[PDB]
Design a protein around this motif. Structure first.
Motif, PDB file in Angstrom:
ATOM      1  N   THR E  61       7.734 -20.790 -15.328  1.00 56.11           N
ATOM      2  CA  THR E  61       6.594 -21.163 -14.665  1.00 56.11           C
ATOM      3  C   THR E  61       5.603 -22.548 -15.373  1.00 56.11           C
TER       4      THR E  61
ATOM      5  N   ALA G  22       1.705 -15.617 -14.085  1.00 53.45           N
ATOM      6  CA  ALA G  22       3.119 -15.506 -14.007  1.00 53.45           C
ATOM      7  C   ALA G  22       3.827 -15.638 -15.603  1.00 53.45           C
ATOM      8  N   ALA G  56       9.814 -10.437 -10.452  1.00 57.04           N
ATOM      9  CA  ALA G  56       9.687 -11.164  -8.986  1.00 57.04           C
ATOM     10  C   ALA G  56       8.297 -10.960  -8.396  1.00 57.04           C
ATOM     11  N   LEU G  57       7.648  -9.797  -8.617  1.00 57.55           N
ATOM     12  CA  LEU G  57       6.646  -9.754  -8.062  1.00 57.55           C
ATOM     13  C   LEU G  57       5.342 -10.683  -8.850  1.00 57.55           C
ATOM     14  N   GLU G  59       5.917 -13.093 -10.679  1.00 55.16           N
ATOM     15  CA  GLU G  59       6.158 -14.405 -10.510  1.00 55.16           C
ATOM     16  C   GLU G  59       5.625 -15.045  -9.057  1.00 55.16           C
ATOM     17  N   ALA G  60       5.827 -14.110  -8.141  1.00 54.03           N
ATOM     18  CA  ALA G  60       5.358 -14.531  -6.807  1.00 54.03           C
ATOM     19  C   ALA G  60       4.065 -15.037  -6.504  1.00 54.03           C
ATOM     20  N   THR G  61       3.343 -14.569  -7.520  1.00 56.80           N
ATOM     21  CA  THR G  61       1.675 -14.917  -7.470  1.00 56.80           C
ATOM     22  C   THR G  61       1.670 -16.411  -7.922  1.00 56.80           C
ATOM     23  N   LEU G  63       4.207 -18.396  -7.568  1.00 57.62           N
ATOM     24  CA  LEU G  63       4.495 -19.368  -6.402  1.00 57.62           C
ATOM     25  C   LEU G  63       3.680 -19.357  -5.295  1.00 57.62           C
ATOM     26  N   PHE G  64       2.538 -18.450  -5.249  1.00 56.07           N
ATOM     27  CA  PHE G  64       1.608 -18.854  -4.172  1.00 56.07           C
ATOM     28  C   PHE G  64       0.491 -19.786  -4.574  1.00 56.07           C
TER      29      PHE G  64
ATOM     30  N   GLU I  59      -2.422  -6.619  -6.823  1.00 57.87           N
ATOM     31  CA  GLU I  59      -1.906  -7.671  -5.688  1.00 57.87           C
ATOM     32  C   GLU I  59      -2.892  -7.911  -4.587  1.00 57.87           C
TER      33      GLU I  59
END
Ligand SMILES: CC[C@H]1/C=C/C=C/C[C@@H](C)[C@H](O)[C@@](C)(O)C(=O)[C@@H](C)[C@H](O)[C@@H](C)C(=O)[C@@H](C)[C@H](O)[C@@H](C)/C=C/C(=O)O[C@@H]2[C@H](C)[C@H](CC1)O[C@]1(CC[C@H](C)[C@H](C[C@@H](C)O)O1)[C@H]2C
Ligand SMILES: CC[C@H]1/C=C/C=C/C[C@@H](C)[C@H](O)[C@@](C)(O)C(=O)[C@@H](C)[C@H](O)[C@@H](C)C(=O)[C@@H](C)[C@H](O)[C@@H](C)/C=C/C(=O)O[C@@H]2[C@H](C)[C@H](CC1)O[C@]1(CC[C@H](C)[C@H](C[C@@H](C)O)O1)[C@H]2C
Ligand SMILES: CC[C@H]1/C=C/C=C/C[C@@H](C)[C@H](O)[C@@](C)(O)C(=O)[C@@H](C)[C@H](O)[C@@H](C)C(=O)[C@@H](C)[C@H](O)[C@@H](C)/C=C/C(=O)O[C@@H]2[C@H](C)[C@H](CC1)O[C@]1(CC[C@H](C)[C@H](C[C@@H](C)O)O1)[C@H]2C
Ligand SMILES: CC[C@H]1/C=C/C=C/C[C@@H](C)[C@H](O)[C@@](C)(O)C(=O)[C@@H](C)[C@H](O)[C@@H](C)C(=O)[C@@H](C)[C@H](O)[C@@H](C)/C=C/C(=O)O[C@@H]2[C@H](C)[C@H](CC1)O[C@]1(CC[C@H](C)[C@H](C[C@@H](C)O)O1)[C@H]2C
Ligand SMILES: CC[C@H]1/C=C/C=C/C[C@@H](C)[C@H](O)[C@@](C)(O)C(=O)[C@@H](C)[C@H](O)[C@@H](C)C(=O)[C@@H](C)[C@H](O)[C@@H](C)/C=C/C(=O)O[C@@H]2[C@H](C)[C@H](CC1)O[C@]1(CC[C@H](C)[C@H](C[C@@H](C)O)O1)[C@H]2C
Ligand SMILES: CC[C@H]1/C=C/C=C/C[C@@H](C)[C@H](O)[C@@](C)(O)C(=O)[C@@H](C)[C@H](O)[C@@H](C)C(=O)[C@@H](C)[C@H](O)[C@@H](C)/C=C/C(=O)O[C@@H]2[C@H](C)[C@H](CC1)O[C@]1(CC[C@H](C)[C@H](C[C@@H](C)O)O1)[C@H]2C
Lengths: 74, 74, 75, 74, 75, 75, 74, 75, 74, 74
Positions: E61, G22, G56-57, G59-61, G63-64, I59
């Motif tokens: 990150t 993340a 993964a969930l 991290e995805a935040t 990645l957005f 989320e």
């Protein structure tokens, strides 16, 4: 010159933000002192000077922020 | 040349924000030292050098911030 | 160029903010080392190198911040 | 002069951010007082003065922020 | 051109802020490794690779932040 | 006059940020009160006034922020 | 056009701040995996896939955030 | 007046930041209520009103933020 | 018009900051799931759906940030 | 009238930052629910309504932020 003086004053305001770290850190030290003495009263004389040292070191970080703040102000 | 000076002063104030990390982190080390010693008084001689090392390393991050601060000021 | 130089100096200051992460992080690692040894003195020689590794990896994030800071100041 | 005065007022606002540190720290101290007294009621008279010291020192960091805020305001 | 360049350099500095996340996160992982090993020395070989994975993923990150930083500084 | 006024209003908004400290801090105190009473119901009368004191002192830091806010908005 | 392009680059930088979430979250998940496995080694095969889902969930935040950063960059 | 109106709108957005304090704080209080009742079911009727009081006082800090926000938007 | 488009792009970048909350919150939920299953394996089928609900609610806060971000971008 | 519009869009992006509090806070409630139920399965029916109440109240703070967001956008 308007610009430079204006930058000194905004910069001085920004320079106080870091003081939040000592606000929080000093508290964390005293919390530990309190929890530690509650769990083991006989350890008070040993940990109290440690707490004073922790406080002063954390506090020094706030002093440095304030130093930069006053340098900008004056 | 007024705009550059203004920027140096703003930059210097911003450069102290990071000192909050040392402020909190120093406290985190001392909290552990205090609680560690309260739970096990006999371990004091072993963990105190570790606390010195840990706070010195955490503190240095704030000194790096201040290095940038003083570069921009002087 | 006055505006660009100004931007380099403000950017340099902004680039030091992330060092608070290593400040806290390094402390978190040493706190665990201390609490771990207090609860289990005999584990010291095992957990001490782990704390050194942990310190170094956390420290590296601050190194990256300062590098950008110095690139903006000088590079 | 308008730009300098504008900077003073923006800076005054920014100078209050660091008060969040005392807001959290003061509470951290009192939480430890409460938890320490709940676990060991007999320790109250010992830890209460430590909590007062702890809160006053944390608060003062926020008062230094407020002091810079007022200097800029007035 | 002066305005775009200045924006790139300001942005580059801003881009390093997120690195504080990896600084704190790497440390959180190594703290758990240390406390886990202190409580249960026999679990060391099992949890050490979990700490390496956790550190690497947290670190990534910060790498993403630094990537954007370098794209602005140079690209 | 336009510039000073605009600065006052921006500053007034900035001045409310510190209120987040009291928002979190008040809650930290009441969390301790609740956990303390759950663990030791007999301590309620002793710790309740400590929670009122703690909340009030934490709250005051937010009041100081709001004071500056209102000075900018009106004074 | 220069002002729009400037805004894109400033915005791209700002868009990476949320990645700190993340950075911390991923670590929070793995810390729980490690502590849970240390306390109860037999539960590893059960919790490991939960940690993978959790990381993964989180991290995805981030990645957005990165996705918005790239949209602005390119 | 274009600059002053602009400043009111940016200030209004800035004034909502502090609501994150009540967001976290309210959660902290209810978390303690839940963990307190789980450990000691019989304390529920004692700690429930304490959680309500704690929620309200934390919430008030967000109310002050939103008030400034609405004063800047409309007042 | 330079101004308006530039404000959309900076605003879109700023709008992603709030995503850090879901990054951290999703992780906190999964950490609790993991710690809870490690301490009481038989409770897995009860708490897993609670963790999925917690995840989705946390989320959703990130979804709203991203919605504002995309509204500004497009 | 371009400057005011620009401000509305910037303000709208800034107005989503506060949603991070709901993101974290929702998670804090669910973490407590999960750990509370794992430690004492029999208390589930009692604490679940409390969790609904707590997350709904924490979430609403983020809805207030979004209210301001949508006011500035539309
Ligand atoms: C690294 C420097 C720090 C030194 C720490 C020394 C610790 C040793 C320890 C034995 C102390 O002396 C002490 C616990 O006895 C102590 O702090 C006393 C002096 C103090 O009077 C204490 C008993 C209090 O009652 C205290 C809560 C006072 O009532 C309160 C009015 C002062 C709060 C405060 O923050 O003061 C600061 C602080 C001491 C700080 C502490 C500075 O000093 C003051 C004066 C100098 C500058 C202006 C600093 C700025 C600050 C932001 O760092 O503020 C100084 C103004
Ligand atoms: C990212 C990789 C890190 C490497 C870690 C290596 C760990 C191995 C481990 C055995 C270490 O060497 C160590 C624990 O012995 C160690 O840190 C010593 C070298 C160090 O002297 C330590 C014992 C101290 O006493 C130390 C607190 C010093 O008194 C103090 C003056 C230095 C603080 C500091 O942060 O220094 C940094 C640090 C080592 C950092 C550490 C960098 O290095 C220095 C020199 C290189 C550059 C300039 C970095 C920049 C910084 C922002 O990362 O700063 C270097 C300037
Ligand atoms: C998801 C990608 C990450 C990969 C992690 C892989 C972990 C596996 C695991 C086996 C590692 O390799 C490791 C624990 O053995 C390891 O870190 C070693 C390579 C490393 O030498 C380690 C043992 C150390 O001693 C280490 C503390 C070093 O002394 C120290 C100087 C390096 C710190 C550091 O942060 O390095 C980074 C890091 C590895 C990062 C981590 C990258 O890599 C470096 C080099 C590559 C690029 C430039 C990255 C960018 C960074 C911003 O993400 O920085 C690279 C510059
Ligand atoms: C250090 C000053 C603080 C004083 C705290 C005193 C605590 C003592 C303790 C006995 C209290 O009085 C109390 C617990 O009984 C109490 O808070 C009551 C007054 C209060 O009615 C309480 C029982 C509630 O029911 C309360 C949850 C109300 O229902 C709720 C509408 C009020 C929330 C609130 O934050 O009010 C504030 C607060 C009391 C704050 C707290 C002020 O006061 C109010 C009115 C005065 C000014 C306008 C402040 C400014 C604020 C920003 O600091 O806001 C005032 C507006
Ligand atoms: C600062 C004082 C606070 C008062 C607390 C009083 C606590 C006593 C306690 C018994 C409450 O009344 C309560 C637990 O029953 C309660 O909150 C109910 C009224 C409430 O309906 C609750 C059970 C819910 O179901 C609730 C989650 C609703 O479904 C949801 C639509 C409302 C969320 C919300 O935050 O509403 C706020 C709140 C009550 C807040 C609470 C304000 O009030 C409202 C109306 C007034 C203004 C507009 C505030 C602004 C907000 C930013 O503080 O928002 C009001 C709009
Ligand atoms: C309140 C809405 C949330 C809904 C939650 C529903 C939960 C129920 C639960 C049973 C899920 O469906 C789930 C656990 O099975 C699940 O998430 C799966 C769909 C998912 O495939 C899961 C098993 C994964 O393996 C997952 C880690 C994926 O591999 C990974 C590529 C996706 C990460 C991710 O964040 O995706 C999001 C997320 C599902 C989110 C979740 C949104 O949705 C996506 C698509 C829609 C938009 C773009 C959101 C934006 C985000 C910022 O909210 O991102 C969607 C793109």
């Amino acid at each position: 010159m308007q610009l430079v003086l204006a930058a000194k004053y905004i910069g001085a305001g920004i320079s106080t933000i870091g003081l939040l770290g000592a606000g929080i850190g000093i508290a964390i030290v005293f919390a530990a002192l309190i929890n530690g003495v509650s769990r083991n009263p006989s350890i008070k004389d040993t940990v109290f000077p440690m707490a004073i040292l922790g406080f002063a070191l954390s506090e020094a970080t706030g002093l440095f922020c304030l130093m930069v703040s006053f340098l900008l102000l004056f």
